[model samples]
Target: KPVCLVVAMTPKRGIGINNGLPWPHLTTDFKHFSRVTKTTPASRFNAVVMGRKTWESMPRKFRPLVDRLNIVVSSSLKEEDIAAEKPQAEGQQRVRVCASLPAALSLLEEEYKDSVDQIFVVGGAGLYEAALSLGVASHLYITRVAREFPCDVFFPAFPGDDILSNKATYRPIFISKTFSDNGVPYDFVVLEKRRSSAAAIAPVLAWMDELIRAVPHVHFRGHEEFQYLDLIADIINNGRTMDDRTGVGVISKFGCTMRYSLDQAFPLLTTKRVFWKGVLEELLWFIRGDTNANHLSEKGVKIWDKNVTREFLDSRNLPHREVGDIGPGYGFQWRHFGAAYKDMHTDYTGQGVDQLKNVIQMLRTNPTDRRMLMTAWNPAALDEMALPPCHLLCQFYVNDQKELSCIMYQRSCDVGLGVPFNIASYSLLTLMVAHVCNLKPKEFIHFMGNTHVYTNHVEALKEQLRREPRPFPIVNILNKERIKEIDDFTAEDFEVVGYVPHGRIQMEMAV
Candidate 1:
């Protein structure tokens, strides 16, 4: 459900020459490209959205990528035109032709939505420019060829001067080790929208909080660095304790809120190492509307591993459930809420109301609409879900200045374990949507209804209070202009810069 851009570029940004790659082929990069665009675990296949020239450039034998949906963008061509060129075979029908990027996406979202998990723009320079200018790309998989090459065609420059001059833009999340194929040096690099930001007011308050408390001022740096600590301190000072079924008890607060800005620094916790990779994978899972744990496990993310066990399912009166089926949780509701909720074994691709899809569409066309929101708490399907939605709903706001903000409403928050990840995930989602819409990210407003900390985490919270907060780090999303769709983003699209946090604080999660 995410849109991604995959390209291999030279230092000069040259991608091709004369309808073909200018540089020699590197099998490593090719395999990576093939895997990324073709693998569709939960669906029948993935989709590759490319331009006419790119399609024409493909060797006849590889014209339509196997086990994948091929969408070719061409203003002057039809599906039949391209189909006629391919060898007569049943597989020829798998390729679709569209006039524009949006048109291509529309066709996929309508008919192939259920059978597709990721949409890719495998390009020609013009198509890449179109996608970049429209802010439709969510991820950029660039094989950073270490050397320049003579070429007539170049990958479009992204986050151009207009975007670069502004503080808001894309950031690099992953930069692979350098590699060489026949001595042609290159590295795989990914860039996505910068999700975390420093509070414009974090420095002063963080310094004040440390200095005023007579705490060691040497270790503390910025207020943003202490954002999590402040929240914990607030609960410790004002929360009311209550007995809970887990017998671990809970220290709770009625209503609380936290605000962050993307302009200053990224809000990744500086006090402890957040399992950022897992956080990103889980968020992508939710965006794809996957309720099964199999996908998560396949990606090396284990947060949901325990939730789908046969024992857990049986305890929930779902004895017949398979090992990896997690019922409908955040992903199911976000992607497919309320269309006769079924088991993960069934193919329900285009069945339910896709709130995430609708939200993205609305944000693009009707940014001023007050009803631009997404909800994960479906009353009718709650019983069927393995876990009721905790962060229930989120409403997005776009200002006249083209700034995007989000207000998330949560019914319950496990402050120590879940709240931190939730904050980063929603903020990242907001940044992705705004990036593709050509809007600047402004703030992430977290509104919680019953924020609580488990008894076992009390000491961990106190320990955090003792440590000094550090300076906030910057989050960057590269090639912001190239992203054309919300789903085009992946965990690989993000990066945290200059983050120096305190030691880790291990805490137990409450279911």
Candidate 2:
């Protein structure tokens, strides 16, 4: 549960412009740098983990703030790099320059195991790579400016979808891209790890309970099939994409989904890590059918703002217009699909607040109807949505035991970011519906359409690959009220216990 946030230091053109920052962008970099440092000094001792090169890369005039504990990771350094017996000035503290990342972390673990709760991994190339390679860091803070500059050494690559942060934000630079012919301009993105607090964990628990109780039951021929889906879900959530360009035309897009099933238990990605909160929030937002940026911005989540803004501007739209509002789209397809899309139907509304409950009732009330399936994708309204449905549609089934099962079909997913939410979201949805239907939820089937990562997020993916998988426990919602209606349940009505995961999984978000 130790939280470590990695803030990658890159130059205007991308790290290592003439050994350090090339242009005069330190003004921008410094603003972020100062914001990170100055905001919180009340905690126990603040510390930094950096490579020797990162140590060397510091501008001399700005080096005085050594007040914070500086933990340097260098295979080369022997004695403490901050060799002074004590801080030269007042606010500063002693520095510990360890030989390796493990050793550096061990030192901190020994000294501030209880007191100093947060650590920041600031770096030169090698140190950051080493930390990522170790998979010890949970969050990534990256400053992504769309303008590319000439450089020698470059910042390491990573998947941006895993970013989790608060006060998380991005702003449009509106810099003229005329020189590059890229149209309008670019924006600078500032990302930090979303801090974990009691408040943050509260809503998710209640939300999850409703979901787990909503989905229907699922059936498989054998335990192997169960394990297959479990693994696939994990793969979709945890797997990384690497470019294999030798035979591929676009090497970056050459990876495949690592599928799994129920026997392997819950399929949370085993690679580097998974940010559960980010997954939950993303799903909730999508469900809200929000096309505007205010919903996310109000909650301090900005991973989608840049693209959302740019999409608006490119379309000659407003900064925050309707993007992914779930109006007549999913609802339209579900309620009124025409002959061209006419597939199946069920007395979905008649089933009750619990969708599963309604579905089971329908099957029992009318057993031989082929039209008893549910739908939720509207192709006729694609242009109105900011993004299409990943969990486009789902179908339910009933068995002799009267147990009800559920299966969701996801159309297109950004494997690294969107899939995790899809799995948890739909699974929970199926669970809630099942409970109200008074039927046992047998299984969850997820059918993925297109699953891929953006080309710019490779290093982030690799960082995740280096992480060892942690055990994922099933979350159960305690419902004492026996409330049969979904509408009756409020945020305060639900509770969860015994949820112990490896910790937060942090990655850079390129929004």
Candidate 3:
């Protein structure tokens, strides 16, 4: 932080002082000077920087020695002017003059690399503007004295969102057991650098390819919407061959079949506006291994209601409750699968548990282990799960170049909201995993089954197809050590490179 303080006095906003006397002063100016000088730390000398006009305005006798280090920053002042009233040494203190503001700043930095405390930008309007343009000051010390005097040179009113005022913290100084005569009823202020948070429409889209090549299709009435529901219910109720052997049958339902890959592009709905917030919240809840909607409802989001409502609640009571909470309590089984059941293996969850995080750690410590797998979908869990996991499970692989690769199994997908964030989130997650595993993300593979556009959401999906996706947002790394937990990342870590999606694509979400 550079210190550039801008100071000026005025008669109703003016700085017209000739030879250090201000229209008879009407009061002691030294008091004003002392307040600013004394308040600033003295261990490190204070340089009161001012413009040429301000320097000339000072009485010839009072030109140099005040109290602290005085620096006059001007392009016009000549050597003769300064030589006329050379600094009269007060004790051991001597005044030093610098040529330019930058030169002065350089001198300060050179002298006190780390010890420099604060820089004061005391000046007229021109000095203030100059310092601002040069970008040196961090805080502005301001004084708002009540009485306004009338004069020739008008002081520029501090711009809005500029000059900050501070409340004086020092106790009133008394002389001879009496308050000083300089009774200026005024307040001191400090202006800090204001930060703003207005995001600009990014220069480029995130999914350019998807935008250009995507097509929009709306879900028309008829049996399309109902058809999706039928398919999902039948799959869960029916069963598929397990390994197509061992006479074992598993539900090859949409929950375990339908999936998409980010390598293809972001999954967005052009049909009805798909609620991404809701979808994201639901995904997070699933990751947390929650069986109830308590946490998600707190966020006022409900992407998993169709599943949760159908599975869990429905399990407690039948009919009236309609469907039980339908989420595949994947965490429950993955972390605590009962060993008694044949073919059932434990994926226990506990301290420092997470498939993605663990895989990265394993790859770094035990790279040869072929069992670096994370499972989010469980057939037994499905009975309790309202619906199966769309992005069911993912596996991690690292190559010799330290490049990382990830492939996901999505059992079900809601094209509109579910897929886009899923791809982005997983993609980022993959990157983080790679970083911790001492590798770089190389590729992503997505597998899908029974993937289709819900007849009703087609039109809305099309709208997304029309929206040119902005460039890929840059991902920021806050603490490199926690790279695996990408969610810990913030906006600062994100940079958007060339991401531009084509026309929106219309797609349907199965209810």
Model 1 misplacement above 4 A? 1-222, 225-227, 479-482
Tens digits of lDDT, candidate 3, 312-360: 4554343333332333355444434432221112233452245545675
How does residue 461 of candidate 2 score in lDDT?
Answer: 47
Cα-based RMSD of the predictions, in order? 22.3, 21.2, 21.6
Q: How do the residues 316-357 of candidate 2 rate in per-residue lDDT, one tens digit apiece? A: 333434442323334334433432321112222322123333
Global CA lDDT of candidate 2, please? 0.47
**Cα lDDT, model 1, residue 48:** 84
The true-versus-predicted C-alpha distance at residue 137 of model 2, in Å, is 31
TM-score rank order: 1, 2, 3
- The per-prediction tally of clashing pairs is 29, 61, 98
Tell me the deviation in Å of residue 100 in model 1. Answer: 70
Q: Which candidate is the best by lDDT?
A: 1
Candidate 1 lDDT tens digits, 289-357: 777889889988888777778777777788777888777778887887787766886777898889987
How far does residue 151 in candidate 2 sit from its true spot (Å)? 55
List candidate 2 stretches off by more than 4 Å.
Answer: 1-373, 480-482, 492-496, 503-505, 508-511
- Give the CA lDDT, 0 to 100, for residue 285 in model 1: 83
Model 2 deviation from native, Cα RMSD in Å: 21.2
| Candidate 3 residue runs with Cα over 4 Å from true position | 1-287, 310-312, 315-328, 337-358, 481-510
Candidate 3 Cα deviation (angstroms), residue 209: 28
